[PDB]
Amino acid sequence: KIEEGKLVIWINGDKGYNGLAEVGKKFEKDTGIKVTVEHPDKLEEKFPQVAATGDGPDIIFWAHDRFGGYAQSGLLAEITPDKAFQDKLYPFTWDAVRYNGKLIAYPIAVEALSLIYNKDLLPNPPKTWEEIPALDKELKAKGKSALMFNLQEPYFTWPLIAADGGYAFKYGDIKDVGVDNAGAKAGLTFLVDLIKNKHMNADTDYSIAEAAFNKGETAMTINGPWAWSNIDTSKVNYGVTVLPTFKGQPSKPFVGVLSAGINAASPNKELAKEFLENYLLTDEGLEAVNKDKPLGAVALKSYEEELAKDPRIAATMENAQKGEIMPNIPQMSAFWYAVRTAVINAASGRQTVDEALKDAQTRITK
Numbered sequence: 001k002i003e004e005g006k007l008v009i010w011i012n013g014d015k016g017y018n019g020l021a022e023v024g025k026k027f028e029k030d031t032g033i034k035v036t037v038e039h040p041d042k043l044e045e046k047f048p049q050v051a052a053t054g055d056g057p058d059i060i061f062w063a064h065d066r067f068g069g070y071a072q073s074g075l076l077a078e079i080t081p082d083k084a085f086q087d088k089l090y091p092f093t094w095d096a097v098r099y100n101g102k103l104i105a106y107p108i109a110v111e112a113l114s115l116i117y118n119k120d121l122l123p124n125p126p127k128t129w130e131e132i133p134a135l136d137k138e139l140k141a142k143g144k145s146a147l148m149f150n151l152q153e154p155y156f157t158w159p160l161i162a163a164d165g166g167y168a169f170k171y172g173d174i175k176d177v178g179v180d181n182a183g184a185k186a187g188l189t190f191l192v193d194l195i196k197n198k199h200m201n202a203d204t205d206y207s208i209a210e211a212a213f214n215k216g217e218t219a220m221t222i223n224g225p226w227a228w229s230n231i232d233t234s235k236v237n238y239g240v241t242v243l244p245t246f247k248g249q250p251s252k253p254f255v256g257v258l259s260a261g262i263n264a265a266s267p268n269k270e271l272a273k274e275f276l277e278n279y280l281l282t283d284e285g286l287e288a289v290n291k292d293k294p295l296g297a298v299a300l301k302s303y304e305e306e307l308a309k310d311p312r313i314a315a316t317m318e319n320a321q322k323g324e325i326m327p328n329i330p331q332m333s334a335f336w337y338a339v340r341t342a343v344i345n346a347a348s349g350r351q352t353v354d355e356a357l358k359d360a361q362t363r364i365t366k
């Protein structure tokens with residue numbers, strides 16, 4: 001079972017879980033109820049497993065795209081924020097955590113990918129993907145490569161795939177899957193070719209991209225606000241700008257709204273909300289986490305005004321506008337799963353962009 005008398009939280013390893021713990025500390029100081037913050041692997045898959053038998057964390061943290069599935073499976077408790085509190089957050093954040101007319105989680109921060117470049121190696125970042133190949137061989141004089149980002153998670157390659165047309169569910173329509181169209185293929189082919197021509201490696205994952213960039217071995221990388229922290233610890237003179245365009249079109253990243261949901265099986269649903277509404281979602285609460293690992297554009301209309309000034313957050317939102325906020329429909333896990341296989345098979349060579357995307361379409365629509 002879920003032990004009552006405490007709060008067990010779950011958040012991804014790339015987020016400021018220490019900053020969250022800190023917030024948990026002052027909760028135990030003002031209430032006596034201790035808080036355990038953990039970051040297990042594939043927590044977004046783990047939760048639905050355990051939470052189905054009535055176990056797991058009291059509150060789960062993840063981008064909103066997964067929450068609809070959880071709510072469909074009766075794993076999330078409905079939240080009860082009074083008008084006053086709802087008004088403390090931007091109306092669009094709420095829409096992202098609404099399912100079948102009920103709010104199924106609390107919005108935290110808006111996440112969008114941006115281009116991170118080493119101002120010293122690249123005082124002027126490219127504006128197009130097409131000019132990156134040349135830039136890569138040009139950078140050989142300095143013994144560097146052009147770009148280097150995570151190729152294992154479709155979240156990171158999706159912007160290039162959508163630039164020229166590719167899409168998941170048209171504006172949330174299940175009856176319209178575009179991971180097989182011209183755009184998708186065009187974009188994925190450009191990526192595959194970058195690997196074909198030795199400008200990128202199919203095995204570059206999150207760890208490899210970060211080390212390579214923070215160690216100043218690469219001129220650019222792609223990531224979210226949560227990555228800024230470690231870049232600060234490397235003294236690298238970086239900048240966060242717009243993502244390169246493809247075929248004249250802007251890269252369209254899937255925007256995610258970090259969210260906090262309460263386990264439907266939690267005996268502590270009452271403590272959870274006090275903690276989420278009066279300890280975390282407060283100016284002082286978010287800074288605690290944002291000081292650990294940046295959260296990006298937070299939903300707390302107040303503490304965000306003291307952050308929207310940051311050129312980084314500005315770029316974050318700029319790319320956010322060039323793309324779209326993800327749907328929260330249950331079908332999303334199937335989408336990400338399909339695309340994941342496709343990009344990895346196409347990248348590695350086990351398949352042609354055509355076969356891979358077709359199969360991705362099939363996996364989503366069957």
Ligand SMILES: OC[C@H]1O[C@H](O[C@H]2[C@H](O)[C@@H](O)[C@@H](O)O[C@@H]2CO)[C@H](O)[C@@H](O)[C@@H]1O
Nearest residue numbers: 012014063065066111153154155256336
């Ligand atoms: O790659 C598919 C994956 O994309 C998104 O995951 C992001 C997440 O939103 C960010 O907060 C951060 O953790 O990076 C992740 C990529 O590794 C979706 O939110 C997720 O459901 C999906 O599986």
